[PDB]
């Protein structure tokens, strides 16, 4: 009951909550477009490995473990070992940047270093240089960086200067120091840079430094580790990582696995399907995840994205920190990072390593196939779990860097793409995070893969990215991505949802980049859109029309292609579409087509005039969206027509005069926004948007189930309670009628009103009185007498309110007002004018004034008056329905709708009583007339009896009941005299009787007279369902009478 009371009826204006929601968007966080792509060009390897010579401060020897680059120099001798080690160092660096320029010095002195640095600077003056200093054979550094370089005589220590080194390499640069007291060098470096800056007031911000350990500590002398531990960690992330694992673990959990097998693990570092390949992939994923989840974005983008070598070195640095911590060394870097050895992700690494190694023995011994770990599957699972309920007010997922890695392979790509799509379906903030990690440059590569099954995923992802970030610098039209989407659109078997998203994408890239303008013609996009104009789906119709409108902007080639194929011939058929959004899209595309085609004029002036007149027909549409678009489209045509209006406007102040009349009509039409624009067009001539509303749709969630289906939401419990309340009030009204109607000598309301209360109406359930005078509507509390705010209708001066009605019982309870000039306005909150009148619409009918009767069971507005016909509009489509012809030669005072018999009920000013049957052919809907009257007929209506007998009153006062199927009457009552219409309320069996005197001669439905009741009459009315009268008087007051 509570639902059906109002939800068996159309709610005509629910769309009005969205039609005007025209908006743009906020700015985007800057920026994923990492334009700064500075790179490393050359590497200088400076070795001081003076094999066979121990500086005097060396403590020796048993645990010295003098293993360098996995070489033991004692087995080769002082010269072979040095060259061999240098070769291995070169190989270790080539694994990370094979294109680097190689430069090497073995025991250089002074001029050798100056010349090296100068030559490298000359090779690339703007790019980065890496300077790697070993120092193992050199005494502990001093504040100046003194080094044991000499002509094979140790007594020539040669003091050096960090300041001078900075001078030689003034370019952006990266320094690596393997010195014992390495931090001392960094401190001196910074102090000298400051000194130089101060001297320049009469390089600090460009250098990156990695030091093995702090200035106050020495590198460990451990018999089982390589001497060059820091270098090994930075250049060979595996190897030592596994050796450490074997040594560090207190109690091994994998019996039988030791170094003898670790050094026999097969495979290439880059062979993704081997043990080492998988381990390198996992290592990279973990170290990137830690960096993402620890550092601020300002550092993350600079260190892990701008340069391949910098990112690799810092990625390995985190490992060096973790390992060297256990030996009382603290690696030092500049810029300084927060500590990371505490992060939980390192436990995952150890687990993965443990799992791998348990298979190593048998694979070596028996040759069993290698099985892959579940690492990425579990990480994807955890992400999927997070997605269960994501909100903005939460920490972002910690695993986005893992998804990025998964997308690079061909095993879990489909799952990662699905989960990414689901993530991106959240509001715009979700997209920004995805952009900040670098999905974009990878999905651009996936866009051109040979796979076909990926189509709906790449389409969805790109639809969301473009919906949020349309600024992408033409990447989809510089490369072949646009061709992909054209093919996607072409596929006749793809679901409409994806065709719609593809059409959206194409519209965006065409209007956004101004380079896709030729490509969309090379692929015959126009032909595809024209074929697709007949698609039944509303959104494909809208977006295809938008694509065509956007194509026909400033193209010369598809000015000609447009005219050549008579594209407009098909677009105007969309002007018949029941849905106003499609009509708006069609008006946009058609107006743009002609406005731009007219630049040639030539023979196309034939088209120019015809379209102008086809648009003229749309003045009858009634929709404010279509109407506004009509005004804009006409203005676009006016731009071209002004060349001839310069000699036509003088007449206004023969298609030109028709256009003048159309624009004048549109200006006159009661939509001030439209009127204003139309007047600006008319004035401009005399003196001399929708696409964004539609576009914002795709930025919303679409996988979300709307609140309307949430059976526990407060909005449902509250609305249902209020619905029951209203129903119970109706029941109270029924009970007071059923208990018996007595003389109406009780009182409810008396208040002084503004103006003359000529129209008095009440809400079906809510005790609120709505009374109109000529110009304005006042409102009152039906029971308390409290005065409510009034609302001036806003109609032109000298107009008059003719009729008022309510449209729905509970939810869409709008107040509709009709006037003599045809204006029909609807407002949502007569109920709450104190805070927001909330105007709904402002239609105009009748192309007696205006009399209306809207059919709530059908959603139809019926109107008559000074047109001599009956007009029907579909208020659920914003479209004219029909003009109903009549043989009458006079106007009417009626009208009344009979929704159960499809009958139009009138009395006529010519004295006859005429009714119409909506089912008859529209030549004349002749059913009756009745011919027992000659004087004008006043308000008439049908009785509650199933037969459909009609009550009709003459201006002479005669009251007569007529037979619904014969021209003869049923009876004559003569209840009242003289010219008094009978307002009857069948539910209450009450008959009102107004007069020139200050009283109402109330009768019962039986015709019996009750002595005149007092609390010139202006208006008679009844509160629906209640046996209570209301009368307005020409003394500026209204009153309400009640059963005693």
């Amino acid at each position: 009951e509570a639902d059906l009371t109002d939800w068996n009826l159309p709610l005509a204006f629910m769309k009005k909550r969205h039609c005007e929601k025209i908006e743009g968007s906020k700015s985007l966080a800057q920026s994923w477009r990492m334009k700064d792509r500075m790179k490393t060009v050359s590497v200088a390897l400076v070795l001081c490995l003076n094999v066979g010579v121990d500086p005097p401060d060396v403590v020796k020897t048993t645990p010295c473990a003098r293993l360098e680059c996995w070489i033991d120099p004692l087995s080769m001798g002082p010269q072979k070992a040095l060259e061999t080690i240098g070769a291995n160092l070169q190989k270790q660096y080539e694994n990370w940047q094979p294109r680097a320029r190689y430069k090497q010095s073995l025991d250089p002195t002074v001029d050798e270093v100056k010349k090296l640095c100068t030559s490298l600077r000359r090779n690339a003056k703007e790019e980065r240089v890496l300077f790697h200093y070993n120092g193992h054979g050199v005494p502990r550094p001093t504040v100046n960086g003194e080094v044991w370089v000499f002509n094979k005589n140790y007594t020539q220590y040669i003091p050096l200067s960090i300041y001078d080194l900075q001078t030689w390499m003034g370019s952006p640069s990266i320094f690596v120091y393997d010195c014992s007291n390495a931090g001392l060098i960094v401190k001196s470096f910074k102090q000298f840079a400051l000194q130089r800056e101060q001297e320049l007031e009469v390089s600090m911000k460009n250098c990156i430094q990695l030091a093995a350990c702090e200035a106050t500590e020495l590198l460990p002398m451990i018999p089982d580790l390589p001497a060059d531990l820091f270098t090994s960690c930075l250049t060979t992330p595996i190897k030592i990582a596994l050796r450490w694992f074997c040594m560090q673990k207190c109690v091994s959990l994998v019996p039988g696995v030791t170094l003898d097998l670790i050094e026999k693990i097969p495979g290439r570092l880059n062979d993704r399907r081997t043990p080492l390949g998988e381990l390198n992939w996992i290592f990279t994923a973990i170290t990137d995840t830690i960096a993402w989840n620890v550092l601020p974005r300002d550092l993350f983008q600079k260190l892990f994205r701008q340069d391949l070598l910098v990112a690799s070195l810092f990625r390995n640095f985190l490992l060096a920190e973790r390992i060297m911590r256990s030996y009382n060394c603290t690696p030092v870097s500049s810029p300084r990072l927060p500590p990371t050895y505490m992060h939980a992700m390192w436990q995952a690494w150890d687990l993965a390593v443990d799992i791998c190694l348990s298979q190593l023995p048998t694979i070596i011994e028996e040759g069993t196939a290698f099985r892959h770990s579940p690492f990425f599957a579990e990480q994807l699972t955890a992400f999927q779990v997070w997605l269960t309920m994501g909100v903005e007010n939460r920490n972002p997922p910690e695993q986005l860097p893992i998804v990025l890695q998964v997308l690079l392979s061909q095993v879990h790509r489909l799952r990662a793409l699905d989960l990414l799509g689901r993530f991106l379906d959240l509001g715009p903030w979700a997209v920004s995070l995805a952009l900040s990690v670098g999905i974009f440059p990878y999905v651009l590569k996936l866009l051109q893969s040979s796979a076909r099954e990926l189509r709906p995923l790449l389409v969805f992802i790109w639809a969301k990215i473009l919906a949020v970030d349309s600024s992408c610098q033409a990447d989809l039209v510089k490369d072949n991505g646009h061709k992909y989407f054209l093919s996607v659109l072409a596929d006749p078997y793809m679901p409409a949802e994806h065709r719609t998203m593809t059409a959206f994408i194409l519209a965006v890239i065409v209007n956004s980049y101004h380079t896709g303008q030729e490509a969309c013609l090379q692929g015959n996009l126009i032909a595809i859109c024209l074929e697709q104009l007949n698609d039944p789906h509303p959104l494909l119709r809208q977006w295809v029309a938008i694509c065509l409108g956007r194509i026909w902007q400033n193209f010369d080639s598809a000015r000609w292609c447009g005219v050549r194929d008579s594209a407009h011939e098909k677009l105007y058929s969309l002007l018949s579409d029941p849905i106003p959004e499609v009509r708006c899209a069609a008006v946009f595309a058609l107006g743009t087509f002609v406005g731009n085609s007219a630049e040639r004029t030539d023979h196309s002036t034939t088209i120019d005039h015809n379209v102008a007149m086809m648009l003229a027909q749309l003045v009858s549409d009634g929709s404010p969206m279509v109407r506004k678009e009509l005004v804009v489209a006409l203005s676009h045509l006016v731009v071209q027509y002004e060349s001839n209006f310069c000699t036509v406007a003088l007449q206004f102040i023969s298609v030109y005069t028709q256009i003048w009349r159309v624009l004048l009509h549109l200006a006159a039409d009661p939509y001030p926004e439209v009127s204003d624009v139309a007047m600006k067009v008319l004035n401009s001539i005399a003196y001399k948007g929708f696409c964004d509303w539609s576009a914002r749709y795709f930025a919303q969630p679409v996988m979300k189930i709307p609140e309307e289906h949430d059976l526990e939401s407060q909005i449902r419990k509250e609305r249902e309670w209020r619905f029951l309340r209203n129903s119970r009030v109706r029941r109270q009204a029924q009970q007071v009628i059923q208990k018996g109607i007595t003389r109406l000598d009780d009182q409810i309301f008396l208040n002084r009103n503004p103006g003359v209360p000529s129209v008095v109406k009440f809400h079906p359930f809510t005790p609120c009185i709505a009374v109109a005078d000529k110009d304005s509507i006042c409102f009152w509390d039906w029971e308390k007498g409290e005065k409510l705010d009034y609302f001036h209708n806003g109609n032109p001066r000298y107009t008059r309110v003719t009729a008022m009605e309510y449209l729905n019982g509970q939810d869409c309870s709008l107040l509709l007002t009709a006037t003599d000039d045809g204006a029909i306005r609807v407002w949502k909150n007569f109920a709450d004018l104190e805070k927001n009148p909330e105007m709904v619409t402002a239609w105009q009918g009748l192309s007696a004034g205006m009399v209306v009767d809207w059919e709530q069971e059908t959603g139809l507005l019926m109107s008559s008056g000074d047109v001599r016909i009956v007009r029907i509009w579909d208020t659920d489509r914003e479209m004219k329905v029909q003009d109903i012809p009549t043989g009458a030669d006079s106007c009417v005072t009626s009208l009344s709708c009979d929704s159960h018999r499809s009958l139009i009920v009138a009395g006529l000013g010519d004295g006859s009583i005429r009714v119409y049957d909506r089912r008859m052919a529209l030549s004349e809907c002749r059913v009756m007339t009745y011919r027992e009257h000659t004087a004008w007929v006043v308000k008439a209506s049908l009785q509650k009896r199933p037969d459909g007998h009609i009550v009709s009153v003459s201006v002479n006062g005669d009251v007569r009941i007529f037979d619904p199927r014969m021209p003869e009457s049923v009876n004559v009552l003569q209840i009242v005299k003289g010219l008094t219409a009978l307002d009857i309320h069948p539910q209450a069996d009450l008959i009102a009787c107004g007069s020139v005197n200050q009283f109402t001669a109330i009768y019962n439905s039986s015709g019996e007279l009750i002595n005149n009741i007092k609390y010139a009459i202006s208006c008679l009315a009844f509160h629906p369902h209640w046996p209570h009268l209301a009368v307005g008087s020409n003394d500026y007051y209204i009153s309400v009478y009640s059963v005693e």
Partner: peptide, 8 residues
């Protein structure tokens, strides 16, 4: 181009 290789 890309920092990481893709098995396109």
């Amino acid at each position: 181009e890309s920092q990481f290789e893709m098995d396109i």
